Amino acid sequence: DIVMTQSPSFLSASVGDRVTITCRASQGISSYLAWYQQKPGKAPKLLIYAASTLQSGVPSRFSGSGSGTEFTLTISSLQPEDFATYYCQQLNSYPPKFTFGPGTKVEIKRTVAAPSVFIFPPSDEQLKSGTASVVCLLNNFYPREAKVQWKVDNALQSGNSQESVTEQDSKDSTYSLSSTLTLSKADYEKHKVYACEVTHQGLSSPVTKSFNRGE
Amino acid sequence: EVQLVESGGGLIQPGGSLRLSCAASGLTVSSNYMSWVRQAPGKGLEWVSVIYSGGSTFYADSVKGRFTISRDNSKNTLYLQMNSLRAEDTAVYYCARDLDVYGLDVWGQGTTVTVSSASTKGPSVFPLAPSSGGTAALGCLVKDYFPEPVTVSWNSGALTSGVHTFPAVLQSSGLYSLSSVVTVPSSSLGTQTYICNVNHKPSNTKVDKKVEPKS
């Protein structure tokens, strides 16, 4: 197997920074790499081919470097347009014609902001349909990395909750993450204390927002 | 006029077939490597298929024997016939022009192909009660609908400040769930009416949900 890996998965920088996105082939691909830019909704756009050659029509601030197993894509001075996700692809990677990387999303950097944590118990309306979804909301935080651990009667839950993170806000460049812990009304009544524990860079301690079922 | 316009994507049951067309302008498809690359929602780019200038066709093992890439020299069009579709094939399919190491220089806009055995269903809207200092958050859980998208507004559009409508998450039931929260002054919990408007045009459903505070 020949695998392409991109690091970091998410990168934070400000307009004007020199940004460098690393791509690593599990084995040498000597110069058979391309670099693509993709924004949400729009199609991928080829930036670099043969690991160093710049595609016609692409800003000169973009550069591709590296040969063999480790490649870099460098933006000398980050522009507002350059906030997007970047993919390195493997040309002529025999079994698939192309093998793309996991993708590096360049993000607006700003001051660390703690998440505003709220917990919403299931509505009586949803409980009338046999289901109970407890929603935990982390509002307006930075950076993206925020850990949300559900506790049901102080038992850490896993595999019955789903997370969703908004795009970086256009005004304050913060993130919001909702985590929905869904379980049957039966299972819901089988427990009492439903808590959401939030670990984040801006919090000195994990913030636990909890409620007792039926209070 | 140097464009690739694909269509034919849509929502189909598993096992059913679907044909993606890609009208080309500014280049001849019979004189090019023309490839189909797919991208699952929130995932990376996956090579699906390719057709050479000489006519030889290649496919990813993931679609081998089910997909058939072809072209119409007359219409200068690329085609991907996707027979016995599986839910794994749910992705945005980009018609691109392969140039082996010169890269995928020209991409199409991309056509979404959703393959699911989940019958189109309207969303159930549940309130996310504010209860609780400072400013408090309330919201709406838009649960168990298919397919995307679902548009959420507040107070018929009169509330946009502090609103975060999270990306939908695909549940284990094949149906999407989505959080839409808003932060508001706590003093507003006794005066301002907060009704979230959920619109799901696929299921022909509109829901205006009052969000009342808890005790």
Added chain:
Amino acid sequence: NLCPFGEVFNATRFASVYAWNRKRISNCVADYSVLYNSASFSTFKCYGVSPTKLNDLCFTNVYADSFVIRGDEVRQIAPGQTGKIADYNYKLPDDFTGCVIAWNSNNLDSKVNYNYLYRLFRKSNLKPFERDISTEIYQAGSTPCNGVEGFNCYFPLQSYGFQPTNGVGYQPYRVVVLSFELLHAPATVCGPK
């Protein structure tokens, strides 16, 4: 009067696959035991003939086609194969009768950034044993290129980025395709016996 397989297999300089070199073997007694028996080969596949049985078997004409591709393209040197090489560089017929001999040449053709070429673009597939050496700027679009490279106008040859650290699939492989001719003529190539 032994056949010169030495100046074909042990040749210092191999040719790029777009311009694959063909050596006409005639009027000699080839010993194929030196090939099928001795040397370490990543691929020695024979079609329509068995490597052991040629040591007493005459042919009117033997064609030794040598070129360089990379590891992932050695599989394309076979009857009924498709890809860059089989379509645009070196096509074998579906009824091919002969042996395809390939070996890794990372230590020979990879230095530091040796350059073998191979045809990227061609308007149609190569006929069996066809050799296209034209450097005509390939026309991908509707506007003719008129011999100047640009967008939609690409040089039809491209250098293999042969670099020592490559993966086995990317490392260079030297290929010699011995094709044996059943012509209605006097036999000029025989086994030693």
